Amino acid sequence: SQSQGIQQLLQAEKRAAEKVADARKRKARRLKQAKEEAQMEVEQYRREREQEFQSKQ
Amino acid sequence: ELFRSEEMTLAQLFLQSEAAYCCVSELEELGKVQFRDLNPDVNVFQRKFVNEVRRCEEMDRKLRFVEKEIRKANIPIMDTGENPEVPFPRDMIDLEA
Amino acid sequence: IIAAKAAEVRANKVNWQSYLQGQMISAEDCEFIQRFEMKRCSEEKQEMLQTEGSQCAKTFINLMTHISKEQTVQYILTMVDDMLQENHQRVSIFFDYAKRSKSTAWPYFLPMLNRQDPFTVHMAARIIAKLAAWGKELMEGSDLNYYFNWIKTQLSSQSDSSQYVQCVAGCLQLMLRVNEYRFAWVEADGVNCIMGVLSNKCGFQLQYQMIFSIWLLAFSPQMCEHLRRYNIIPVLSDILQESVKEKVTRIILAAFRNFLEKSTERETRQEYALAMIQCKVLKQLENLEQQKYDDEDISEDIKFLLEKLGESVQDLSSFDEYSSELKSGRLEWSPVHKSEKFWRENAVRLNEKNYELLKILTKLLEVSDDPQVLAVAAHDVGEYVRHYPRGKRVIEQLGGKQLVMNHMHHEDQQVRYNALLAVQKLMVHN
Amino acid sequence: ALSDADVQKQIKHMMAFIEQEANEKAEEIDAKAEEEFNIEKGRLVQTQRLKIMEYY
Amino acid sequence: VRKMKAIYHTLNLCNIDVTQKCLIAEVWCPVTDLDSIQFALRRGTEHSGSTVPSILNRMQTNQTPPTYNKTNKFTHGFQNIVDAYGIGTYREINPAPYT
């Protein structure tokens, strides 16, 4: 009978395990996503400073 | 009745870790159950709550020391009759302090 | 309170045609909702959202606006919430609809929060939080002002109301997850609302949620600097004694680490740490360190906090700090007073500047109106003799001997007790 | 019925407690990563923009 | 402190995270007191502020239970005496009343 409770707990814990593995893996994946997004910022900076540099010219 | 012995049976309990202490304290207040040991495979001093028993032993040691000082001295000790259940909250550490 | 009504609403389907035939909604709206209900598989749902996306949020809004009986409106709201759970990206359809309508997303939904049904209003709130946290379009200006004002009013109710405040705090947290809403909430008096509801003995889950919020604020350096105007730590330290649960204990430990980490200045770290130590967090951290827990965060945070609190204790034990508290009259049990190692290292420092420290102590022994200051002066005078043998004659010269042996008859038992301790120090030997 | 129903419903509440605790831990890491990788990107972009500013 | 020592012994006797985060206990109890046992657990939840419930499970047991005889002041000495040669088995005939 107690194996019933133990089974249900182990199954809920498997669910927790996969959910929390995704939670952790999100850090690893979004680090790369940020490594990508840096391009947006740097290119925008370059274009802006190009505009004001043209003004100076 | 006394005609023959008791009809005892086995059981078990699930409860959240935090509530375990308070609930088993209420079972101590009740007094109609006997607990097993689910980890005889390793010593009791190597379970989840080693330090907790270590400090209770040491605190009782110190209380025995002060009681011995009391007996050496002339002050009595109060047998007030109150026998409360020990608080589960971390007021434990206040009692320690 | 949320779950049972959500489950009932998932099943309380009724004919959407009842209102089209009454001319309260449009034929395309009714057709969209009926087709979407029939199209249940994930691919079919995506096909509907991608073929009639412009009609989707319009159907939702029209029915929610014009419907009297809640069951259908709750059905739409629960469907949107469950669809966001299935795929968080579903916030995008609302933004597509709003952009096609040449409008921001908020005026469509914010009025719903003023409707009558607590379930429906709070589900609208959850939907708004998801939408404006995930989407590119943040909430801003008067719109965010009213939204957080509604959050504040729902908090002001402070039980089914508390279980709805669970959703209120959940929305608040899902929003604070993004930085802008954090500064908005600190600009508002909402942090005072958190303080008020916490002090008003709200329920365990709600405690975890608001400590989650303060932990989010502490994550940010400037928000951490802001929140000192409330000083949660005196409340949290003692409430930790009751909240032994892993959830709350973990989150408070994390908030403590965040305070001491993201404090902007050395003085900010000293303020937070002083609050901690004078409210006795260090002994609790030692006890928790003796304790062991499920996951990394609790124990790693306890270890970090022990490191930082120890560093703060050493700083307060600095000889310069001792002299400065003597000059500033702060003889109020700073860790320097009870740190025995400091006394062993620096008892000779009380001879510096021709015993000016002892002179301050012995002048305070007849100038201190505060019994705390008087007692600490007597105790420190005794500790000086304990830690520096030649100080016996120095104290006899300065009158600390007589002053403490008299003040053991001072009108305050605390001063009497400390003076007896000091005289015992003097009489440690010949 | 009552015995099985009680055991099942209470252990379902216990499963729900477990899964909500796991969700809270997952949310904790969710927020901490939000802090960390975003300030990492802040530092990287700050260096990139400083290089661009020196060039300009 | 002595009650505390007893309770910490009791909790160290429980199964641990390797089984599950929530603590598990194993107990001997008479069939007449199951309701009171669960009620004691309920009071404990009330005090601890545990909204998640305690649960008590039976299990058909091949193992031998302890023995009890509902002693009273008058009969205690007689029960002690008859058990001194050996503690009776599960609800077997008790010699005390006739002795």
TrEMBL record, chain A:
<comment type="subunit">
    <text>V-ATPase is a heteromultimeric enzyme made up of two complexes: the ATP-hydrolytic V1 complex and the proton translocation V0 complex. The V1 complex consists of three catalytic AB heterodimers that form a heterohexamer, three peripheral stalks each consisting of EG heterodimers, one central rotor including subunits D and F, and the regulatory subunits C and H. The proton translocation complex V0 consists of the proton transport subunit a, a ring of proteolipid subunits c9c'', rotary subunit d, subunits e and f, and the accessory subunits ATP6AP1/Ac45 and ATP6AP2/PRR.</text>
</comment>
<comment type="similarity">
    <text>Belongs to the V-ATPase G subunit family.</text>
</comment>
<comment type="function">
    <text>Subunit of the V1 complex of vacuolar(H+)-ATPase (V-ATPase), a multisubunit enzyme composed of a peripheral complex (V1) that hydrolyzes ATP and a membrane integral complex (V0) that translocates protons. V-ATPase is responsible for acidifying and maintaining the pH of intracellular compartments and in some cell types, is targeted to the plasma membrane, where it is responsible for acidifying the extracellular environment.</text>
</comment>
<feature type="compositionally biased region" description="Basic and acidic residues">
    <location>
        <begin position="33"/>
        <end position="53"/>
    </location>
</feature>
<protein>
    <recommendedName>
        <fullName>V-type proton ATPase subunit G</fullName>
    </recommendedName>
</protein>
